[PDB]
Amino acid sequence: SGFRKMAFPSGKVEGCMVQVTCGTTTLNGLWLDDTVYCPRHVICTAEDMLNPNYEDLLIRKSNHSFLVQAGNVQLRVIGHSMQNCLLRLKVDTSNPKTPKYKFVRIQPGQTFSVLACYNGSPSGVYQCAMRPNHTIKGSFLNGSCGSVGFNIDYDCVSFCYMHHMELPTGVHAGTDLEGKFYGPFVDRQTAQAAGTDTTITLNVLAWLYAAVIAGDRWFLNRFTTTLNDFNLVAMKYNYEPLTQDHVDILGPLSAQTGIAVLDMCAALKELLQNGMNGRTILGSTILEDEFTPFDVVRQCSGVTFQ
Amino acid sequence: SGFRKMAFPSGKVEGCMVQVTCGTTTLNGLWLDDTVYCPRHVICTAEDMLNPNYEDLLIRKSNHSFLVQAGNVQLRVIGHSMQNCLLRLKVDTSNPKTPKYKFVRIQPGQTFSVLACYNGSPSGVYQCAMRPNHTIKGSFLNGSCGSVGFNIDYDCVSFCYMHHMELPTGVHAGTDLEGKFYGPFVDRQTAQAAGTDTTITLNVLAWLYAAVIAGDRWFLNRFTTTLNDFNLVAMKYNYEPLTQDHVDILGPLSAQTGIAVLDMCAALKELLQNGMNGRTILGSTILEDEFTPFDVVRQCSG
């Protein structure tokens, strides 16, 4: 009953958060076994960020250049290397709190929990979605770099995001845990800006299904639509085009409710053209688009971890 | 930059979550040191919940009537007692993960994080505010009872809420960690229903200040108001009357943004009279009241 955008319990990730200092720059690092992963621009300052030479700046740094702190424990760095936009520090202590984990690259529209840290000290946790324009609308202040986003299934923490920078509009850009940025962005001070963005249609449909599962179903109708005709309407409202693959992904929710996806599209189409008329869906006056088909099954079907 | 309904990191609470069973009934419990706290209605069944006498129900139970488990492992109960609407079950082991903590009773209008659990295992975390009417608008499924709400300041966890029940409107009710219910609710199946509710004026203002801190000020205007004249308007919109105390709380944000509280009130006044006009504030098409002034200061730029 009731509908919240829930984060994953952050405990398994809190246990991996450390503070990384290099010179006067301090940000967050991710400690798994005997490796600390952090944004490579921890070795940077000012005009360094103005078109930096990373290979080169790193070369003048040695192991004792990086101070690493887990709580009060100082971790001795015994190795460093660069991996794409990531720095990999080898430490002499394997993290006793390392969860079962993996590194996955997330697809646009998909969601994850973010653990905002400052000085290696976790400060908050929230859900967000990887925007179609390859940014995240997060909440980050100075010193938040190195904070990570993640998903859980069973006992396995899947890390998908590490925070690197803030774009001109106040949205955020970052990398997977191999150091490859999401979107065009680069870790320098340039003119780079967020592209225009769209509403995540797949997620809106997922959420509409969640409403129906909760008994909130006034918006359904007796009609259906072709994919092509849905996309013509939807795109006029700045919705991501719905693909046959998105339709297949809504299969389980579709089967579970006995409402065919295109039947739900007809309902959405009507909602966009005529609005909601003062009524609400799942308590909202607005159509939510940060809730995936998987978040719906997770939240509605009491899953735990673990 | 950005603005999220941020919960506290939940790991210090996760480490305290256990399962408590009695008869056929299972729910969550909070394991701190050598004591496990859970809702007393775990000892109730069928027509027990129609009109339970808890003293009479409990006296029929022994220590071994209670099965407590941390994950897959059983903790032996070696004592039991009732504190208002909670059971306190002493166990033979101490919980090494027990964080620095305290129990606090929170005022309506304040916020906290909830860690929704089923079977003594963490499901998710979310932020919410206690309504003026003492209910919380939550996301709970059958089995979430015993789940707790908390705030973390420093390394010390302050527990303020334990979940007991769901009301007819689908809104939820529970107690502080001493068993005292928030609101006029009791742990029976009565016809009790959520009382009239109001929008949390103090929170709305703090949120407006957050918007200004974010470089947005389209909603501002050239007027001021008296406290008295603000209330005469806001109270027509189901808004919680605003006091001088509320105004003083807003001092830090006012000073920081250079906007006087009563001027910010005059802004909110106009927003109520004229509406938002399809325009958003911090990405919202409606006014948010689930961020206290303290939440804003904690999240937003200094």
Coordinates of C-alpha atoms in Angstrom, one line a residue:
Chain A
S1 CA 0.0 0.0 0.0
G2 CA 1.2 3.5 -0.9
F3 CA 3.9 4.1 -3.5
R4 CA 7.4 5.3 -2.8
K5 CA 10.5 5.5 -5.0
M6 CA 12.7 3.2 -2.9
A7 CA 16.5 2.9 -2.9
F8 CA 18.2 -0.3 -2.1
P9 CA 19.5 -0.8 1.4
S10 CA 22.9 0.9 1.2
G11 CA 24.8 -1.1 3.9
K12 CA 26.8 -3.3 1.6
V13 CA 28.0 -0.2 -0.3
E14 CA 28.5 2.0 2.8
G15 CA 31.1 -0.6 3.8
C16 CA 33.2 0.1 0.7
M17 CA 33.3 4.0 0.8
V18 CA 36.7 5.6 1.5
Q19 CA 38.3 9.0 1.3
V20 CA 41.0 9.7 -1.3
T21 CA 43.3 12.7 -1.0
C22 CA 45.9 13.9 -3.5
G23 CA 47.5 17.2 -2.8
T24 CA 44.6 19.5 -1.9
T25 CA 42.0 17.5 -3.8
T26 CA 39.8 15.2 -1.6
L27 CA 37.1 13.0 -3.0
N28 CA 35.5 9.5 -2.5
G29 CA 36.9 6.1 -3.4
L30 CA 35.3 2.6 -3.8
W31 CA 37.2 -0.1 -1.9
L32 CA 36.8 -3.7 -3.0
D33 CA 39.2 -6.4 -2.0
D34 CA 42.6 -4.7 -2.2
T35 CA 41.8 -2.1 -4.9
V36 CA 40.4 1.4 -4.5
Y37 CA 38.7 2.8 -7.6
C38 CA 38.3 6.6 -7.9
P39 CA 37.9 9.4 -10.5
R40 CA 41.3 10.0 -12.2
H41 CA 40.8 13.8 -11.8
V42 CA 41.7 13.5 -8.2
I43 CA 45.2 14.3 -9.4
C44 CA 44.0 17.5 -11.0
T45 CA 43.6 21.2 -10.1
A46 CA 42.4 24.4 -11.8
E47 CA 43.8 24.7 -15.3
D48 CA 44.7 21.0 -15.0
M49 CA 41.0 20.6 -15.6
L50 CA 41.5 23.0 -18.4
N51 CA 42.5 20.3 -20.8
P52 CA 44.7 18.0 -18.6
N53 CA 47.4 15.5 -19.7
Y54 CA 46.5 12.5 -17.5
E55 CA 49.2 10.1 -18.5
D56 CA 51.6 12.8 -17.7
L57 CA 50.2 14.2 -14.5
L58 CA 50.0 10.7 -13.2
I59 CA 53.6 10.1 -14.0
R60 CA 54.8 12.8 -11.5
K61 CA 52.7 11.1 -8.8
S62 CA 53.9 8.2 -6.7
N63 CA 52.1 5.8 -4.4
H64 CA 52.6 8.1 -1.4
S65 CA 50.9 10.8 -3.4
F66 CA 47.5 9.4 -2.6
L67 CA 46.2 9.4 1.0
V68 CA 43.5 6.8 1.4
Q69 CA 41.3 6.7 4.5
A70 CA 38.7 4.2 5.6
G71 CA 37.1 5.6 8.7
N72 CA 40.2 6.3 10.8
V73 CA 42.3 3.6 9.3
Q74 CA 44.9 4.9 6.9
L75 CA 45.3 2.5 4.0
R76 CA 48.8 2.2 2.6
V77 CA 48.8 2.6 -1.2
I78 CA 51.2 0.1 -2.8
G79 CA 50.2 0.5 -6.4
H80 CA 48.5 2.8 -8.9
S81 CA 47.4 2.6 -12.5
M82 CA 44.9 4.4 -14.7
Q83 CA 42.0 2.7 -16.4
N84 CA 40.1 4.9 -18.8
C85 CA 38.8 7.7 -16.6
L86 CA 39.5 5.7 -13.4
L87 CA 42.4 5.6 -11.0
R88 CA 43.1 2.1 -9.5
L89 CA 45.0 2.2 -6.2
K90 CA 46.3 -1.1 -4.8
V91 CA 46.2 -1.1 -1.0
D92 CA 47.9 -3.5 1.4
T93 CA 44.5 -4.4 3.1
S94 CA 41.8 -6.4 1.4
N95 CA 38.4 -4.9 2.4
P96 CA 36.9 -7.1 5.1
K97 CA 33.5 -5.7 4.1
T98 CA 33.7 -6.6 0.4
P99 CA 30.2 -7.8 -0.7
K100 CA 29.6 -10.2 -3.5
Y101 CA 29.7 -7.7 -6.4
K102 CA 30.0 -7.1 -10.1
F103 CA 30.5 -4.3 -12.5
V104 CA 27.8 -3.7 -15.1
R105 CA 27.3 -0.9 -17.6
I106 CA 23.7 0.4 -17.3
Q107 CA 21.4 1.2 -20.2
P108 CA 19.6 4.5 -20.6
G109 CA 16.3 4.8 -18.8
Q110 CA 17.3 2.2 -16.3
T111 CA 17.6 3.0 -12.6
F112 CA 19.9 2.5 -9.7
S113 CA 20.5 3.8 -6.1
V114 CA 23.1 6.5 -5.5
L115 CA 25.0 6.7 -2.2
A116 CA 26.1 10.4 -1.9
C117 CA 29.4 10.6 0.0
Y118 CA 31.7 13.4 1.2
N119 CA 35.2 12.8 2.6
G120 CA 34.6 9.0 2.4
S121 CA 31.6 9.4 4.7
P122 CA 28.2 8.3 3.2
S123 CA 25.7 11.1 3.6
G124 CA 22.5 10.0 1.9
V125 CA 20.9 7.6 -0.5
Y126 CA 18.4 8.1 -3.3
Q127 CA 17.0 6.5 -6.5
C128 CA 17.6 8.0 -9.9
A129 CA 17.4 7.0 -13.5
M130 CA 20.0 7.1 -16.3
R131 CA 18.4 9.7 -18.5
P132 CA 17.9 9.1 -22.2
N133 CA 20.3 12.0 -22.7
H134 CA 22.9 10.0 -20.7
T135 CA 22.9 12.2 -17.6
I136 CA 21.5 11.7 -14.1
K137 CA 19.4 14.3 -12.3
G138 CA 21.2 13.7 -9.0
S139 CA 21.9 15.8 -5.9
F140 CA 25.6 16.5 -5.5
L141 CA 27.7 19.2 -3.7
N142 CA 31.4 19.8 -3.8
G143 CA 33.4 16.7 -2.8
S144 CA 30.7 14.3 -4.0
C145 CA 32.9 12.9 -6.8
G146 CA 33.5 9.2 -6.4
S147 CA 30.1 8.5 -5.0
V148 CA 28.6 5.4 -6.7
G149 CA 25.3 4.1 -8.0
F150 CA 24.2 0.5 -7.8
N151 CA 21.6 -2.2 -8.0
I152 CA 21.2 -5.4 -5.9
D153 CA 19.8 -8.8 -6.7
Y154 CA 20.1 -11.6 -4.1
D155 CA 23.5 -11.0 -2.5
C156 CA 25.2 -9.4 -5.5
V157 CA 25.9 -5.7 -5.6
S158 CA 26.0 -4.5 -9.2
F159 CA 27.9 -1.2 -9.4
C160 CA 27.0 0.7 -12.5
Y161 CA 28.0 4.4 -11.8
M162 CA 30.6 6.6 -10.4
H163 CA 30.1 10.3 -10.2
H164 CA 32.7 12.6 -12.0
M165 CA 31.2 16.0 -12.9
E166 CA 28.4 18.5 -13.0
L167 CA 27.2 19.9 -16.3
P168 CA 26.1 23.5 -16.8
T169 CA 22.4 22.8 -16.2
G170 CA 23.1 21.2 -12.8
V171 CA 22.7 17.6 -13.9
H172 CA 25.5 15.1 -13.5
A173 CA 27.8 13.0 -15.6
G174 CA 30.0 10.0 -14.8
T175 CA 31.4 6.6 -15.7
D176 CA 30.8 2.9 -15.4
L177 CA 33.2 1.1 -13.1
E178 CA 35.6 0.5 -16.0
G179 CA 36.0 4.2 -16.3
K180 CA 34.1 4.7 -19.5
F181 CA 31.8 7.7 -19.4
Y182 CA 28.1 7.5 -20.0
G183 CA 27.3 9.7 -23.0
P184 CA 29.7 12.0 -25.0
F185 CA 31.0 13.7 -21.9
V186 CA 34.7 14.0 -20.9
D187 CA 36.6 14.7 -17.7
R188 CA 37.8 18.2 -18.6
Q189 CA 36.5 21.7 -18.4
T190 CA 35.0 22.2 -21.8
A191 CA 31.8 23.6 -23.3
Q192 CA 30.1 20.2 -23.1
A193 CA 26.5 20.4 -22.2
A194 CA 23.5 18.1 -21.8
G195 CA 21.6 17.3 -24.9
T196 CA 17.8 17.7 -24.9
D197 CA 16.1 14.9 -23.0
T198 CA 12.9 12.8 -23.2
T199 CA 10.4 11.1 -20.9
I200 CA 11.2 7.4 -20.5
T201 CA 8.2 5.8 -22.1
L202 CA 9.1 2.3 -21.0
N203 CA 9.2 3.5 -17.4
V204 CA 5.9 5.4 -17.6
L205 CA 4.2 2.2 -18.9
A206 CA 5.8 0.2 -16.1
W207 CA 4.5 2.7 -13.6
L208 CA 1.0 2.6 -15.2
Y209 CA 1.1 -1.2 -14.7
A210 CA 2.1 -0.7 -11.1
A211 CA -1.0 1.5 -10.7
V212 CA -3.2 -1.2 -12.1
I213 CA -1.6 -3.8 -9.8
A214 CA -2.4 -1.5 -6.9
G215 CA -6.1 -1.3 -7.9
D216 CA -5.7 2.3 -9.2
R217 CA -7.1 1.7 -12.7
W218 CA -9.5 4.5 -13.8
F219 CA -7.3 5.4 -16.8
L220 CA -7.8 2.1 -18.7
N221 CA -10.0 2.0 -21.7
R222 CA -11.6 -0.5 -24.2
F223 CA -9.3 0.5 -27.1
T224 CA -5.9 -0.3 -28.5
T225 CA -3.3 1.1 -30.9
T226 CA -0.5 0.3 -33.3
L227 CA 3.1 0.9 -32.2
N228 CA 3.4 3.4 -35.1
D229 CA 0.4 5.4 -34.1
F230 CA 1.5 5.4 -30.4
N231 CA 4.9 6.8 -31.3
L232 CA 3.3 9.6 -33.4
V233 CA 1.4 10.9 -30.4
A234 CA 4.0 10.1 -27.8
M235 CA 6.8 11.9 -29.6
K236 CA 4.7 15.0 -29.9
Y237 CA 4.9 15.1 -26.1
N238 CA 8.6 14.4 -26.0
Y239 CA 8.4 10.8 -25.1
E240 CA 11.1 8.3 -26.1
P241 CA 9.9 6.2 -29.0
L242 CA 8.6 2.8 -27.9
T243 CA 10.4 -0.1 -29.6
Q244 CA 9.3 -3.7 -30.1
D245 CA 12.0 -4.5 -27.5
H246 CA 10.5 -2.2 -24.9
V247 CA 7.2 -4.0 -25.6
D248 CA 8.8 -7.4 -25.0
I249 CA 10.3 -6.1 -21.8
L250 CA 6.8 -5.2 -20.5
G251 CA 5.7 -8.8 -21.2
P252 CA 5.7 -10.1 -17.6
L253 CA 3.8 -7.0 -16.3
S254 CA 1.5 -7.3 -19.3
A255 CA 0.9 -11.0 -18.7
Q256 CA 0.4 -10.5 -14.9
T257 CA -2.3 -7.9 -15.5
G258 CA -3.8 -9.4 -18.6
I259 CA -3.5 -6.0 -20.2
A260 CA -1.6 -6.0 -23.6
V261 CA 1.1 -3.4 -24.0
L262 CA -0.6 -1.7 -26.9
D263 CA -3.8 -1.6 -24.9
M264 CA -1.9 0.2 -22.2
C265 CA -0.4 2.6 -24.9
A266 CA -3.9 3.5 -25.9
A267 CA -4.5 4.5 -22.3
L268 CA -1.3 6.5 -22.1
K269 CA -2.1 8.2 -25.4
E270 CA -5.4 9.4 -23.9
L271 CA -3.7 10.5 -20.7
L272 CA -1.3 12.7 -22.6
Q273 CA -3.9 14.3 -24.9
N274 CA -6.6 14.9 -22.2
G275 CA -4.5 15.0 -19.1
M276 CA -5.7 13.5 -15.8
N277 CA -8.4 15.9 -14.9
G278 CA -7.5 16.6 -11.3
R279 CA -7.4 12.9 -10.5
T280 CA -4.1 11.1 -9.5
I281 CA -2.3 7.9 -10.3
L282 CA -0.5 6.2 -7.5
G283 CA -0.9 9.5 -5.5
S284 CA 0.8 11.5 -8.3
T285 CA -0.6 14.4 -10.4
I286 CA 2.2 13.7 -12.9
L287 CA 3.2 10.6 -14.9
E288 CA 6.2 9.1 -13.2
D289 CA 9.1 8.0 -15.5
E290 CA 11.8 7.0 -13.0
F291 CA 10.3 3.6 -12.2
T292 CA 11.4 0.6 -14.4
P293 CA 9.6 -2.7 -15.2
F294 CA 12.0 -4.2 -12.7
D295 CA 11.5 -1.6 -9.9
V296 CA 7.8 -2.4 -10.2
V297 CA 8.2 -6.1 -9.6
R298 CA 10.7 -5.5 -6.9
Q299 CA 8.6 -3.0 -4.9
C300 CA 5.2 -4.6 -5.5
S301 CA 6.4 -8.2 -4.9
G302 CA 8.3 -7.8 -1.6
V303 CA 11.9 -8.8 -2.5
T304 CA 14.7 -8.7 0.1
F305 CA 18.5 -8.6 0.3
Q306 CA 20.0 -10.9 1.5
Chain B
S1 CA 23.1 20.9 -7.6
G2 CA 19.9 18.9 -8.0
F3 CA 17.4 18.2 -5.3
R4 CA 16.4 14.7 -4.2
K5 CA 14.1 13.2 -1.5
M6 CA 17.2 11.8 0.3
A7 CA 17.1 9.1 2.9
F8 CA 19.8 8.4 5.4
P9 CA 22.2 5.5 4.5
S10 CA 20.5 2.5 6.1
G11 CA 23.4 0.2 6.9
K12 CA 23.6 0.9 10.6
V13 CA 19.9 -0.2 10.9
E14 CA 20.2 -3.2 8.5
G15 CA 22.6 -4.6 11.0
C16 CA 19.9 -4.6 13.7
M17 CA 17.1 -6.2 11.7
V18 CA 15.8 -9.5 12.9
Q19 CA 12.8 -11.8 12.5
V20 CA 10.4 -12.5 15.4
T21 CA 7.9 -15.4 15.3
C22 CA 5.2 -16.4 17.7
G23 CA 2.7 -19.1 16.8
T24 CA 2.0 -18.7 13.1
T25 CA 2.7 -14.9 13.1
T26 CA 6.0 -13.5 11.9
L27 CA 7.3 -9.9 11.7
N28 CA 10.4 -7.8 12.0
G29 CA 12.2 -6.7 15.2
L30 CA 15.0 -4.4 16.2
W31 CA 18.0 -6.1 17.8
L32 CA 20.0 -3.6 19.9
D33 CA 22.7 -5.1 22.2
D34 CA 21.0 -7.9 24.1
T35 CA 17.4 -6.8 23.5
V36 CA 15.0 -7.3 20.6
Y37 CA 12.1 -4.8 20.2
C38 CA 9.0 -5.6 18.1
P39 CA 5.3 -4.9 18.0
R40 CA 3.4 -6.7 20.8
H41 CA 0.6 -7.7 18.4
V42 CA 2.8 -10.5 17.2
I43 CA 1.4 -12.5 20.0
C44 CA -2.2 -12.1 18.7
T45 CA -4.3 -14.2 16.4
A46 CA -7.7 -14.2 14.8
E47 CA -10.3 -12.9 17.2
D48 CA -7.5 -11.8 19.5
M49 CA -7.0 -8.8 17.2
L50 CA -10.7 -8.0 17.4
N51 CA -10.3 -7.2 21.1
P52 CA -7.0 -8.3 22.6
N53 CA -6.1 -8.1 26.2
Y54 CA -2.4 -8.1 25.9
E55 CA -1.6 -8.7 29.6
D56 CA -3.8 -11.8 29.4
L57 CA -2.4 -13.0 26.1
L58 CA 1.3 -12.4 27.2
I59 CA 1.0 -14.1 30.5
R60 CA 0.1 -17.3 28.6
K61 CA 3.4 -17.2 26.8
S62 CA 6.9 -18.4 27.9
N63 CA 10.3 -17.3 26.6
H64 CA 10.3 -20.3 24.3
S65 CA 7.0 -19.1 22.8
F66 CA 9.2 -16.7 20.8
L67 CA 11.4 -17.7 17.9
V68 CA 13.9 -14.9 17.1
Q69 CA 16.3 -15.2 14.2
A70 CA 19.2 -13.2 12.8
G71 CA 19.2 -14.3 9.2
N72 CA 19.2 -18.1 9.2
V73 CA 20.3 -18.3 12.9
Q74 CA 18.2 -18.5 16.0
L75 CA 18.7 -16.3 19.0
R76 CA 17.5 -17.9 22.2
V77 CA 15.0 -15.8 24.2
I78 CA 15.8 -15.6 27.9
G79 CA 13.4 -12.9 29.0
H80 CA 10.3 -11.0 27.9
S81 CA 8.3 -8.0 28.9
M82 CA 5.8 -5.4 27.6
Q83 CA 6.5 -1.7 27.3
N84 CA 3.3 0.0 26.1
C85 CA 2.7 -1.4 22.6
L86 CA 6.1 -3.1 22.1
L87 CA 7.5 -6.4 23.3
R88 CA 11.1 -6.4 24.7
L89 CA 12.7 -9.8 24.2
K90 CA 16.0 -10.3 26.0
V91 CA 18.3 -12.7 24.1
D92 CA 21.4 -14.6 25.1
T93 CA 23.7 -13.0 22.5
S94 CA 24.7 -9.4 22.0
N95 CA 24.6 -7.7 18.6
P96 CA 28.1 -6.6 17.7
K97 CA 26.6 -4.4 14.9
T98 CA 24.6 -2.4 17.3
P99 CA 25.3 1.3 16.4
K100 CA 25.5 4.2 18.8
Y101 CA 21.8 5.1 19.1
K102 CA 19.0 6.7 21.0
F103 CA 15.2 6.6 21.1
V104 CA 13.4 9.9 20.3
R105 CA 9.8 10.8 19.9
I106 CA 9.4 13.0 16.9
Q107 CA 7.0 15.9 16.3
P108 CA 4.4 16.0 13.5
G109 CA 6.0 17.7 10.5
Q110 CA 9.4 16.2 10.9
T111 CA 11.0 13.8 8.5
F112 CA 12.8 10.4 8.8
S113 CA 14.1 7.5 6.8
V114 CA 12.3 4.1 6.8
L115 CA 13.9 0.8 6.1
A116 CA 11.1 -1.5 4.9
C117 CA 11.8 -5.1 5.8
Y118 CA 10.0 -8.4 5.3
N119 CA 11.0 -11.4 7.4
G120 CA 13.8 -9.5 9.2
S121 CA 15.5 -8.8 5.9
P122 CA 16.0 -5.4 4.3
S123 CA 13.9 -4.6 1.2
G124 CA 14.3 -0.8 0.6
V125 CA 14.9 2.6 2.1
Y126 CA 12.9 5.8 1.7
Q127 CA 12.4 9.3 3.2
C128 CA 9.1 10.5 4.5
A129 CA 7.5 13.0 6.9
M130 CA 5.1 12.4 9.7
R131 CA 1.8 14.1 8.8
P132 CA 0.3 16.7 11.1
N133 CA -2.4 13.9 11.7
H134 CA 0.4 11.5 12.8
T135 CA 0.1 9.1 10.0
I136 CA 2.8 8.5 7.4
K137 CA 2.2 8.1 3.6
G138 CA 4.3 5.0 3.1
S139 CA 4.9 2.0 0.9
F140 CA 4.3 -1.2 2.9
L141 CA 3.1 -4.7 2.1
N142 CA 1.8 -7.3 4.5
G143 CA 4.8 -8.4 6.6
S144 CA 6.5 -5.0 7.0
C145 CA 5.4 -4.6 10.7
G146 CA 8.3 -3.9 13.0
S147 CA 10.2 -2.0 10.3
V148 CA 11.6 1.2 11.8
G149 CA 12.1 4.9 11.0
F150 CA 15.2 6.8 11.9
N151 CA 17.5 9.8 11.5
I152 CA 21.3 9.7 11.6
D153 CA 23.2 12.7 12.9
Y154 CA 26.9 12.0 13.1
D155 CA 27.5 8.3 13.8
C156 CA 24.5 8.1 16.2
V157 CA 21.2 6.6 15.0
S158 CA 18.1 8.1 16.4
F159 CA 15.1 5.7 16.1
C160 CA 11.7 7.5 16.1
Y161 CA 9.3 5.0 14.6
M162 CA 8.2 1.4 14.5
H163 CA 5.6 0.3 12.1
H164 CA 2.4 -1.4 13.5
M165 CA -0.5 -1.1 11.1
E166 CA -2.2 0.1 7.9
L167 CA -5.3 2.3 8.0
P168 CA -8.3 2.2 5.7
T169 CA -7.0 5.1 3.5
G170 CA -3.8 3.1 2.9
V171 CA -1.8 5.4 5.2
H172 CA 0.2 3.9 8.0
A173 CA 0.5 4.1 11.8
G174 CA 3.0 3.2 14.5
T175 CA 4.9 4.1 17.6
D176 CA 8.1 5.6 19.0
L177 CA 10.6 3.1 20.4
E178 CA 8.9 3.1 23.8
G179 CA 5.7 1.8 22.4
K180 CA 3.7 5.0 22.5
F181 CA 1.5 5.4 19.4
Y182 CA 1.8 8.5 17.3
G183 CA -1.8 9.7 17.0
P184 CA -5.0 8.3 18.5
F185 CA -4.5 4.7 17.3
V186 CA -4.6 1.4 19.1
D187 CA -3.3 -2.0 18.2
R188 CA -6.7 -3.6 17.6
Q189 CA -8.9 -4.0 14.5
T190 CA -11.2 -1.1 15.3
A191 CA -12.9 1.4 12.9
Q192 CA -10.1 4.0 13.6
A193 CA -9.3 6.3 10.7
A194 CA -6.8 9.0 9.9
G195 CA -7.8 12.4 11.3
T196 CA -8.1 15.6 9.2
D197 CA -4.7 16.6 7.7
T198 CA -2.9 19.8 6.7
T199 CA 0.0 20.8 4.5
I200 CA 3.2 21.4 6.3
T201 CA 3.7 25.2 5.9
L202 CA 7.1 25.3 7.5
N203 CA 8.4 22.7 5.2
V204 CA 6.9 24.4 2.1
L205 CA 8.7 27.6 2.9
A206 CA 12.0 25.8 3.5
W207 CA 11.6 24.1 0.1
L208 CA 10.9 27.5 -1.5
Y209 CA 14.2 28.6 0.0
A210 CA 15.9 25.5 -1.5
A211 CA 14.6 26.6 -4.9
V212 CA 16.2 30.1 -4.4
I213 CA 19.5 28.5 -3.3
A214 CA 19.4 26.7 -6.6
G215 CA 19.3 29.9 -8.5
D216 CA 15.6 29.9 -9.1
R217 CA 13.3 32.8 -8.1
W218 CA 10.5 33.3 -10.6
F219 CA 7.9 32.8 -7.8
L220 CA 9.2 35.8 -5.8
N221 CA 7.4 39.1 -5.6
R222 CA 7.6 42.7 -4.4
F223 CA 5.3 42.4 -1.4
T224 CA 5.6 41.5 2.2
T225 CA 3.0 40.3 4.6
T226 CA 2.2 40.2 8.3
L227 CA 2.3 36.7 9.9
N228 CA -1.4 37.4 10.6
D229 CA -2.3 38.1 7.0
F230 CA -0.4 35.1 5.7
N231 CA -2.3 32.8 8.0
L232 CA -5.7 34.3 7.0
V233 CA -4.9 33.2 3.4
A234 CA -2.9 30.0 3.9
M235 CA -5.5 28.5 6.4
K236 CA -8.0 28.7 3.6
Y237 CA -5.9 26.3 1.6
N238 CA -5.7 23.6 4.3
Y239 CA -2.3 24.9 5.4
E240 CA -1.0 24.4 8.9
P241 CA -1.1 27.8 10.8
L242 CA 2.4 29.3 10.9
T243 CA 3.9 30.6 14.1
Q244 CA 6.7 32.9 15.1
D245 CA 8.6 29.8 16.1
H246 CA 8.3 28.6 12.5
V247 CA 9.6 32.0 11.3
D248 CA 12.6 31.9 13.6
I249 CA 13.5 28.4 12.4
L250 CA 13.7 29.9 8.9
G251 CA 16.3 32.4 10.0
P252 CA 19.4 30.6 8.7
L253 CA 17.9 30.1 5.2
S254 CA 16.5 33.6 5.2
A255 CA 19.9 35.1 6.1
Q256 CA 21.6 33.0 3.5
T257 CA 19.3 33.9 0.6
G258 CA 18.8 37.5 1.7
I259 CA 15.0 36.9 1.5
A260 CA 13.0 37.9 4.6
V261 CA 10.7 35.2 6.0
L262 CA 7.6 37.4 5.6
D263 CA 8.6 38.2 2.1
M264 CA 9.0 34.5 1.3
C265 CA 5.6 34.1 3.0
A266 CA 4.2 36.8 0.6
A267 CA 5.6 34.7 -2.2
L268 CA 3.9 31.5 -1.0
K269 CA 0.7 33.6 -0.4
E270 CA 0.7 34.5 -4.1
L271 CA 1.5 31.0 -5.2
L272 CA -1.6 29.8 -3.3
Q273 CA -3.8 32.5 -4.7
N274 CA -2.7 32.3 -8.4
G275 CA -1.2 28.8 -8.6
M276 CA 2.0 27.7 -10.3
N277 CA 0.9 28.3 -13.9
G278 CA 2.3 25.1 -15.5
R279 CA 5.6 26.2 -14.1
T280 CA 7.8 24.0 -11.9
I281 CA 9.8 24.6 -8.7
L282 CA 12.8 22.3 -8.2
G283 CA 11.3 20.3 -11.0
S284 CA 8.0 19.9 -9.1
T285 CA 4.6 20.9 -10.4
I286 CA 3.1 21.1 -6.9
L287 CA 4.4 22.5 -3.6
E288 CA 6.5 20.0 -1.6
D289 CA 6.1 19.8 2.1
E290 CA 8.3 16.8 3.0
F291 CA 11.6 18.7 3.5
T292 CA 12.1 20.3 6.8
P293 CA 14.3 23.4 7.1
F294 CA 17.0 21.2 8.5
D295 CA 16.7 18.8 5.5
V296 CA 17.3 21.7 3.1
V297 CA 20.3 23.0 5.0
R298 CA 21.7 19.4 5.1
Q299 CA 21.3 18.7 1.4
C300 CA 21.7 22.1 -0.3
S301 CA 24.7 24.3 -0.9
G302 CA 26.0 26.4 2.0

